């Protein structure tokens, strides 16, 4: 005695993958212009009895971010200039003018014969290197991209800070947040609330600490795929920032050579006082409290009666051993044996990290695509705050009572995915049916 | 009020109340321009299948499919008010396509139906 | 059953029972934007027969009949001729001409309809 | 008495010119690009439908023709560009192994190279084939460097052809001709309606059609117009005729980095005895085919006339022989041994010689060619001859006596081989007709 | 026989009768450029059909609702609107009351479309 | 007592800026070929009782328009031979073979090695360049070396303008003005509708106005704000004053491949006398368009004033010199010889002419842009080209305060304003179909 009833505008969803679009506040690399104006006052609503089911393993959106990045990145380098006059031989010398022992063999002083604007003439240019960027080739040296790739130097005018961007749903589609604190990451979630953009993002690049992100409404919050699995990284999100101080303790006067029609070339040209080695200072006892709190919250998964230890990263590529970050435009490469060297069983001091420089970048993990980070003029400091850890495990240790962690990384997806973890995208479904009493 | 998806997690008597709140929120550098002709092709094919089944113009249509207790054999007080569209979703999502293909079916006889009697 | 076109070659009479079926499969690098393309076009021709169906007063509905006379002057055949001795494709081709004057006059008629829908609500 | 009756789903269409996107199951087609297909596709069969097809006015032709080509110069896009190697070569003959029939068929060329750093070169030698060579006044240069510029084919990315569905828009169809012995124009008695074709392979070949469609009864002679003698004729087999390809040398494959990132392949060696590239057909199954078609050509020249096949009468070597890309590596292969008989009312075989060349030019355009790499190894492959394309010589008009050649080289003309039963249409769905029923 | 918006300048009550002649064109490098001009004029032509969905006016071009006429609004006798007035000055009077009508027509409609679902139980 | 009512399709629209399409006729640096085809009948609905309100230097439609054609533009030298093996110390030496006067270091004899078909192999050429293109560093180089590659265009597309209609999209439309004497920046009680605008020719020049629409009655006079000295005024002509250029030497052009491919122009030989390259006008046509021009300009600057033109003076060529595209070549054209007299209340107005001195070049910048430069390559034989003056664009000195004396020089360099001197007549707006109104019917 009852009859189906047709209903329009039901509130119900499914899981679906679609396409995402980049919104941003009213140069840069992440095409912020051309990213969609925002909304000044963004909708949150709360769904009071809706649980909903987050796994951020399996969440596309990050997936998105990944490939956005890399394709704005690269569009940012198609008008710059191609530098492949400069896979010469180089004919280089020790800087010797300035040593504290720390910097020995850290520069060289290179000199070469460069082409000029006219296709007739050369010129004969001296520069500086940061070691790291020149290989032998048998005094007579090459760049190190020379056997993989030809060289683009990046744009002078066009900065690699980040900005917040935001993601954006299309019409039919709507992103769903967890507000549960102290959420993991992957099972039911009893508090969300639908919105329609994600909080702005700051798509900061760095491996094993992670810089300037969200912290932990609470407590230290450890989140994995697997902790059993010791192949699976583990996501440290921290409840308090640890503040980190980096600097580049030389002045740099910056030098440019016409190479072509509409070409020139940025380089060091010298440097102005003695020569120090870059380094990233952290208070000990901020980070001795940060590491108290990640092992108590390793414990509740190892056991009470478990050492915690860690250690220094095992090898790797330099961009996976060291933290890589960004600061002033130039590009650091961080010792982080500093910080996790200890173990832990059941006042103005600061811990000084040394850092290398680098100038030709492979990002992304790729093969074939370098690039030339110009020089940056003067002296350089960038103030930061670690807001999350990168660790793996040492597995095999199936009859010990001592679990070791190290600071792993390189894979950015895990950092986009430590700010993307509470957000899932749904599919409207406005369409559906239901017994009543009324018939046409 | 409550918002956009607010009565998800209603019940189903509540739900309904608000169906102008979630249809108004539908339909509202390639990749966005992907996006925006996704948006109307969703919204068409709802509409289309309205209109096959004599709805076209309206939020809540009645029609002359009886209720098969094999879809689901519940009381309304346990359905209506004591249920949310999710959990209602999910339990009858097996029987949409043959649902729909009967609404399809009733609307073609109907119309037939109609033109025969104006003819007379 | 038969299929999307399946019923064509069938007679005017048979072929009006499925017209569902033809309902349901309308809407179902530079070669990004040529499958864009694709479903723009799609989408166009539609909403174009969708708004004639509305202006004409027939909106979400197969069969709409209306207050416009038949013209023999159109068409002179017998009602059985029509339909049970021809297709519809034969049908259209033998009143292709006439089709301007057709749709001319039943936006007309329904425009006068609605006026006086309107008129005899206020009354 | 009557009244207008509007009915919307009306199963009508009319021809029409749509744009159709392609489907499929690195490669230079890039699939990766395609609609995934449906695994079971459908096909409606249209009792009491006739249509007229007309295939040598189909849009469809047009458009796989414009998509064949971008595809190709696609995949070349990021592919290693080889203009440091217009040089003056130095080269002498290969001689130490050369049976009679490759004197003077390959070339020993030195020349100074590029590395990857731009103040240093490098001497470099290999071997070319002499169609790609050119002399200069011992001093060569490659044939390309007073037209166009060369880009090396990718390596990894593969030429074979994969089946491409073409697919109709929604609002569209597109309709099949399943009439057997149907000769490409005119009314089709039996017809079906699909929204995508079969695969389709786009196989690139000048004068014999491999790897399409058999007849499903006897030999199909199509054309655009029989006794015009500026049209081609477009023969479909009833039986495959089995065609196998060699390249008996042993390649040695080195190669070279010539500038950051980028490197160049060629031939550095042969490793046993040089001989000649060619492509074996068998006598008995060639000549029952070829009776085939002279039955059937004389249905349209008379019952009692002489049918002649003569070879090619003169042109590029692209329509002179019979090309194709056979393991990757292109081929120039002379017909001359399958079309020499005049007709008049066990296991022995033809053995056609071969050419082969690296530069080549593609789609009759100027300016734009690609070195193809040399494989490595010794190739075979092993095809299937489904149709031929032929031409007429004007004849005298007063003697019963008709000739015909291998023609082609347009390459609509391969296509038009498979899209010959597919028509696209529009569907009208909006239509009137009187009835007793006012609103 | 006017053309498109032919009756701009007429009065309200004149133009009223043209409604099919702007209806019918409603949705009748530069690749792109002409796709998104294309999509666009079909975003905006959905967006008008659905606030007549949602009102009850789905199938026509003069629609009568259960809305009452607040003198808040504006204040006219009918004589001096439909006689005495184009439809942009009309437009240009009744632009800051628009948000306030749209929302009371689809209350009204809701609120008819449950009562017809419980009569129809009965 | 009285009702909503629901209509829809009312006439009405709003000011609204989307984007236009275009349109054309069924090669060129406009790709017109990639235009929609234009209806041969286009329908224009005149709109009676309409007032609108138009304003010229708030019109999107302009912005389009430049972008358009810098964007057709640029796409025409994609495929186009970059002269990067060009850019070589020159040779130089002065022509003195049989040259006139005025043509007196204005040509030198350039002998460089440039690159062949082989990379082993150079060649080399003997050419003649414009003394604008070469500077020196007998050393010379080309002007373009310090800033930009140069690209030759293609010798197969044209430069000629073409019309090009605008088109609005569906739900759009375009109001025109059909006012007389409109300035621009107020009411027009004279409006019509159309889809589609007339076509434009997209001519680009910089003092004169070439080849546009004229005024239909009388000379008008128009600018953002006629009494801010730092704004251009446009001239709109009510008669044509016929300009008639010319190149007379008769130039050889030879060619030669410098690489797989690829080919260079340029000039070889002269093989008359060298002359000066010039413009006519007729003196009577321009002293009346003058007296027609100030009898307006006392509209605005009354009172008996004395009317003075002067001319154009500052360093940049494209801003003092009139500049245009004749025959695909590039002239600048000196107009002291048109804009150097005194006007005032008391003074008025055979085969006659005034004949303007003009100066040629081959590397170009345009769209005031740095870093991109386009090689014209020569043309065999003499060019001749007859064009019609339809406007000006003029410029006011200021500083005077405690002056009757007005004086006025040529202006330019901006091509909006180029753009603006057609479009000046039409206004995008948004149709806007769907309202309410009250009535007495209730459903
Ligand atoms: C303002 O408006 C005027 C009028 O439209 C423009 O003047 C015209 O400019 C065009 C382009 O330069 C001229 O067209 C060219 O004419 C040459 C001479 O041809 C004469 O002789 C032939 C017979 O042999 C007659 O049919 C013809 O009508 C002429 O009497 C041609 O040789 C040119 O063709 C060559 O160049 C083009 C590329 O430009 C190639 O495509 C051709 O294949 C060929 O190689 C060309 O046709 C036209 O004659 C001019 N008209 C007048 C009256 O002078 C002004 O230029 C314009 N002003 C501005 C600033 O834009
Ligand atoms: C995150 O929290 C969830 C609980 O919400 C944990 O999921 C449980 O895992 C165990 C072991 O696989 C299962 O037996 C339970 O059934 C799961 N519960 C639920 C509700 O799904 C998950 O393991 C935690 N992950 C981390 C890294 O802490
Ligand atoms: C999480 O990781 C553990 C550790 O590898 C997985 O458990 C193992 O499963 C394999 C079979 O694939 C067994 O042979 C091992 O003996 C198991 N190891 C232990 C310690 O139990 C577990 O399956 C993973 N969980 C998921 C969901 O994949
Ligand atoms: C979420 O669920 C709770 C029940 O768990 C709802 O609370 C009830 O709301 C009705 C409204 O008619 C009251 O009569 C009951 O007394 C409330 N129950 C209790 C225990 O207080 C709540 O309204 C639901 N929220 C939403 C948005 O639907
Ligand atoms: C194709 O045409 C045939 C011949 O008219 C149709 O078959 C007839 O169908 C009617 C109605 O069922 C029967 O009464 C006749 O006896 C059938 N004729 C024969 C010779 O069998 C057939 O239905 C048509 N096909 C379609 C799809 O309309
Ligand atoms: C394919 O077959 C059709 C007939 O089915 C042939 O068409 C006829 O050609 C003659 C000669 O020009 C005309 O007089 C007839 O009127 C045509 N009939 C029809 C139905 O079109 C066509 O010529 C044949 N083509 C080939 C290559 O064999
Ligand atoms: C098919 O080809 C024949 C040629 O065999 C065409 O007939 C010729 O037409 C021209 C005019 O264009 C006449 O001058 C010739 O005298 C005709 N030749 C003969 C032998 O009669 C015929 O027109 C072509 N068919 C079509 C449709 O174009
Ligand atoms: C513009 O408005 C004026 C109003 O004065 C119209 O002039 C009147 O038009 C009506 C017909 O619509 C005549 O009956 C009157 O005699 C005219 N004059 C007066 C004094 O009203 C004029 O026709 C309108 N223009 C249009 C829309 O064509
Ligand atoms: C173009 O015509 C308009 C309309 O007559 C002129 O606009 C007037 O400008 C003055 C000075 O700014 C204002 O005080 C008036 O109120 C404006 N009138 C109207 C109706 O808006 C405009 O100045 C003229 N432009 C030129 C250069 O003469
Ligand atoms: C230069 O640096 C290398 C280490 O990279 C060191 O072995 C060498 O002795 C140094 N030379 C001088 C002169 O200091
Ligand atoms: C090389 O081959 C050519 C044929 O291509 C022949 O004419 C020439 O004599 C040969 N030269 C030598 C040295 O064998
Ligand atoms: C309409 O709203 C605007 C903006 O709040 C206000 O300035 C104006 O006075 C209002 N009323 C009228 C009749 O314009
Ligand atoms: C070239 O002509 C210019 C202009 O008259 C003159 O200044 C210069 O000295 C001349 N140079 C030579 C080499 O004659
Ligand atoms: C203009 O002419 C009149 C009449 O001849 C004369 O009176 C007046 O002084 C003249 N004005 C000037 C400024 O010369």
Redesign the interface.
Do not use: M
């Given at each position: 005695n009852?009859?189906?009833?047709?209903?329009?505008?039901?509130?119900?969803?499914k899981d679906a993958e679609?396409?995402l679009?980049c919104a941003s506040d009213a140069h840069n690399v992440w095409a912020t212009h051309?990213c969609?104006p925002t909304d000044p006052n963004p909708?949150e609503?709360?769904?009071?009895?809706?649980t909903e089911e987050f796994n951020m393993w399996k969440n596309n959106m990050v997936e998105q971010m990944h490939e956005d990045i890399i394709s704005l990145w690269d569009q940012s380098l198609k008008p710059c200039v191609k530098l492949?006059?400069l896979?010469?031989?180089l004919q280089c010398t020790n800087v010797t003018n300035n040593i504290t022992d720390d910097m020995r063999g850290e520069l060289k002083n290179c000199s070469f014969?460069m082409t000029t604007?006219?296709?007739?003439?050369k010129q004969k240019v001296y520069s500086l290197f940061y070691r790291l960027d020149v290989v032998q080739?048998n005094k007579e040296y090459?760049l190190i991209?020379?056997?993989?790739?030809?060289?683009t130097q990046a744009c002078p005018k066009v900065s690699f800070e980040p900005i917040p961007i935001h993601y954006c749903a299309?019409?039919?589609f709507?992103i769903l947040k967890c507000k549960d604190k102290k959420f993991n990451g992957t099972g039911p979630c009893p508090s969300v609330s639908?919105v329609q953009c994600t909080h702005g993002i700051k798509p900061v690049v760095s491996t094993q600490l992670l810089l300037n992100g969200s912290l932990a409404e609470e407590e230290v919050i450890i989140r994995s795929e697997n902790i059993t699995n010791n192949a699976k990284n583990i996501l440290v999100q921290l409840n308090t920032p640890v503040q980190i101080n980096c600097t580049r303790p030389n002045n740099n006067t910056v030098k440019s050579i016409?190479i072509?029609?509409?070409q020139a070339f940025y380089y060091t040209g010298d440097i102005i006082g003695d020569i120090r080695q870059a380094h990233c200072n952290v208070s000990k006892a901020t980070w001795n409290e940060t590491l108290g709190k990640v092992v108590k919250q390793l414990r509740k998964h190892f056991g009470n009666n478990t050492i915690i230890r860690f250690a220094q990263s095992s090898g790797g590529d330099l961009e996976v051993t060291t933290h890589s970050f960004n600061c002033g435009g130039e590009f650091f490469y961080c010792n982080t044996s500093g910080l996790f060297n200890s173990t832990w069983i059941s006042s103005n001091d600061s811990i000084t990290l040394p850092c290398r420089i680098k100038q030709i970048i492979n990002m992304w993990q790729r093969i074939?695509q370098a690039m030339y980070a110009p020089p940056i003029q003067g002296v350089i400091r960038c103030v930061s705050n670690i807001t999350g850890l990168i660790l793996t495990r040492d597995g095999g240790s199936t009859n010990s009572t001592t679990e070791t962690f190290r600071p792993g990384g390189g894979d950015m997806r895990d950092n986009w995915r430590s700010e993307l973890y509470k957000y899932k995208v749904v599919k409207?479904?406005?369409?559906?049916?239901?017994?009543?009493?009324?018939?046409? | 009020s409550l918002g956009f998806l607010g009565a998800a997690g209603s019940t189903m008597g509540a739900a309904s109340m608000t169906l102008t709140v979630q249809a108004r929120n539908l339909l509202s550098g390639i990749k966005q321009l992907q996006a925006r002709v996704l948006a109307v092709e969703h919204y068409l094919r709802d509409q289309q299948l309205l209109g096959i089944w004599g709805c076209s113009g309206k939020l809540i249509c009645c029609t002359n499919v009886p209720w098969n207790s094999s879809w689901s054999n519940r009381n309304l007080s346990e359905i209506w008010d004591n249920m949310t569209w999710l959990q209602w979703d999910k339990e009858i999502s097996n029987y949409t396509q043959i649902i729909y293909g009967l609404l399809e079916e009733s609307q073609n006889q109907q119309e037939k139906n109609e033109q025969d009697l104006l003819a007379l």
């Open positions: 009852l009859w189906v009833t047709v209903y329009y505008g039901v509130p119900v969803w679609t396409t679009f051309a969609v909708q609503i709360h769904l009071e009895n809706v492949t006059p896979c010469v031989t014969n604007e006219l296709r007739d003439k080739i090459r991209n020379c056997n993989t790739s030809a060289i299309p019409a039919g709507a639908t016409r072509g029609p509409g074939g409207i479904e406005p369409l559906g049916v239901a017994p009543t009493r009324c018939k046409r | -």
